[PDB]
Structures are given as C-alpha cells and as structure tokens.
C-alpha cells in the first residue's frame, strides 16, 4: 500500500503540503470530505488537475514521492484525502490523510445490500456521459471506517487487462460490456471483510490499472456480510 501521513492540521489562508511515498509511478489524490459520500478526484497523474477542480490544488512529484499542495486552504477543503498509485501489478491506495482546517459523466452502481456469508455478489456499474469504450474502468471498496482498497481493474477492450487486489484474487472476476456501457464485479465466497461501500471507477486511460489515473467515481453501492 501507500504511505501518507495519518493527519495535518492547518488554518484557512495556509499552504497545505501532504507527501506520499510507495508508488512505482505516477500519484493521485482523492478527496472525502465524509466517510459516506463519494470520493473526489482533485489531482490525477501527478500533476493533472480535473477541470472543475479550484485551482488552489495542484500536484507535483519528485523523485518518487508525490506532493498534494493546498494554496490558500479554506474550510470546505476539510476532508480525508487519499492518494493512489500502483505496484506490483496492481492499484494501490495510502491509508489517507485527514486534514483538518481550524476554522455529465456518471456511474451508478447496483447489486449491493445484505449477503449471505459464503456466497456471491454482482455488482453493476452503469456508465453515461463519455464514450466508455476508450476508458478503462475498475473498482474500489471501503469497509465502514477504513480507507479506499483497490479491487479490480479492466482494459477498455475488456479482454486484454484485467487484474485484482490480492484480497479478492480467486474469488472476484471483473467483466464489462462495451455495447451496454457496463462494468460487472463479481464476488464469491464472501466473508466479513468484504463488507464496504463498492465504487465504479474510470480511469483517463485506456488500459492502465493505476490508481493514480482515477477522474470519476460512482455513487456507491453498500455490500454488507452478515
């Protein structure tokens, strides 16, 4: 995983810095600012900054630790933010930073809700608003209290990509469907710890599985195994 650190403080007017190490490339930083809403994409590949985005965020990276920079934070910026990367063959996520301040694409996600422990889930994603064949998509979990896990990944061509967090490896198979502008995660031999908020993801690529390339998420879908 990740490495950033586990908090910062900071008054509004501040220029915030938050580091993060352990990527084999690029950097992306995701903003929650609840545990039950969406995440934000506030910076992608290092540098990229999404276009509805304010401009006092940007991003850098150095050698091979990547830098979110805050340039005049103000309250509303009160969030967890969380970078994302990649390595060894898969996304990968920093357990998150919370920083406090002291003063048309969609995807919609579905198949969630009570699990039988032992059996299997299916989870569709529902894209709109861009052409979801050029872009590869994936999927990020969140256990109640925890940060982001990367799931699963796959290739615009929904063949030639596909990869899966150690986690799941043997029990999940993602698979999309071009025509249908859907991605399917399938689950099996479900256990406690898969329960989580399950996130479409698309990624502004074609075929990468980093989780620093992440411009848009879903809504979430709670999967709970009791």
């Given at each position: 995983?990740?490495?950033?650190?586990?908090?910062?403080?900071?008054?509004?007017?501040?220029?915030?810095?938050?580091?993060?190490?352990?990527?084999?490339?690029?950097?992306?930083?995701?903003?929650?600012?609840?545990?039950?809403?969406?995440?934000?994409?506030?910076?992608?590949?290092?540098?990229?900054?999404?276009?509805?985005?304010?401009?006092?965020?940007?991003?850098?990276?150095?050698?091979?630790?990547?830098?979110?920079?805050?340039?005049?934070?103000?309250?509303?910026?009160?969030?967890?933010?969380?970078?994302?990367?990649?390595?060894?063959?898969?996304?990968?996520?920093?357990?998150?930073?919370?920083?406090?301040?002291?003063?048309?694409?969609?995807?919609?996600?579905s198949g969630?809700?009570?699990?039988?422990?032992?059996?299997?889930?299916?989870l569709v994603c529902?894209?709109?608003?861009?052409?979801?064949?050029?872009?590869?998509?994936?999927?990020?979990?969140?256990?109640?209290?925890?940060?982001?896990?990367?799931?699963?990944?796959?290739?615009?061509?929904?063949?030639?990509?596909?990869?899966?967090?150690?986690?799941?490896?043997?029990?999940?198979?993602?698979?999309?469907?071009?025509?249908?502008?859907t991605?399917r995660?399938?689950?099996?031999?479900?256990?406690?710890?898969?329960?989580?908020?399950?996130?479409?993801?698309?990624?502004?690529?074609?075929?990468?599985?980093?989780?620093?390339?992440?411009?848009?998420?879903?809504?979430?879908?709670?999967?709970?195994?009791?």
């Open positions: 995983a990740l490495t950033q650190p586990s908090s910062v403080s900071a008054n509004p007017g501040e220029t915030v810095k938050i580091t993060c190490s352990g990527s084999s490339g690029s950097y992306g930083w995701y903003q929650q600012k609840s545990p039950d809403s969406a995440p934000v994409t506030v910076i992608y590949q290092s540098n990229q900054r999404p276009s509805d985005i304010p401009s006092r965020f940007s991003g850098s990276k150095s050698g091979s630790t990547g830098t979110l920079t805050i340039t005049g934070v103000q309250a509303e910026d009160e969030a967890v933010y969380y970078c994302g990367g990649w390595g060894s063959s898969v996304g990968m996520f920093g357990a998150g930073t919370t920083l406090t301040v002291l003063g048309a694409v969609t995807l919609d996600e969630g809700g009570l699990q039988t422990p032992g059996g299997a889930l299916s529902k894209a709109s608003g861009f052409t979801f064949s050029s872009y590869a998509m994936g999927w990020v979990r969140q256990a109640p209290g925890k940060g982001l896990e990367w799931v699963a990944g796959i290739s615009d061509d929904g063949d030639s990509y596909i990869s899966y967090a150690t986690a799941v490896k043997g029990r999940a198979t993602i698979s999309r469907d071009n025509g249908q502008s991605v995660l399938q689950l099996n031999n479900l256990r406690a710890e898969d329960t989580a908020t399950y996130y479409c993801a698309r990624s502004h690529c074609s075929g990468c599985r980093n989780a620093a390339l992440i411009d848009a998420w879903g809504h979430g879908t709670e999967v709970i195994v009791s």
